[PDB]
Amino acid sequence: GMQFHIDDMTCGGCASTVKKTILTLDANATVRTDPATRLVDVETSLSAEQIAAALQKAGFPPRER
């Protein structure tokens, strides 16, 4: 996809931290977050594991979907 579910992304403000995290890792990435579903869609040249590793370190451990 790539797509993650992030159980700890419980509001608009967590979603913003998630988005900023990813865009700091890859300024060319496209990220969509949905607080209703806790799903995060990412377009990036980076691997899923790289994105996940960053999300984990920021306190938002994901599961890849």
Residue 32, interface with its own copies (CB under 8 A)? yes
**Site membership for its own copies, residue 30 (CB under 8 A):** yes
36 scored as a contact of its own copies (CB under 8 A): no
Could you tell me the two tokens for 8?
A: 């700890």
Distance, CA of 39 to CA of 34 (rounded, Å): 6
* Stretch touching its own copies by CB under 8 A, among 1-9, 23-31, 48-56, 57-65: 23-31
Percent composition of the chain: helix, strand, coil (DSSP 3-state, to 5): 35, 25, 40
Q: Pick between residue 30 and residue 47 the one whose CB is nearest to its own copies.
A: 30
- Between CA 50 and CA 27 the distance in angstroms is 14
Enumerate binding residues for Ag ion (CB under 5 A): 10-11, 13-14, 30-31
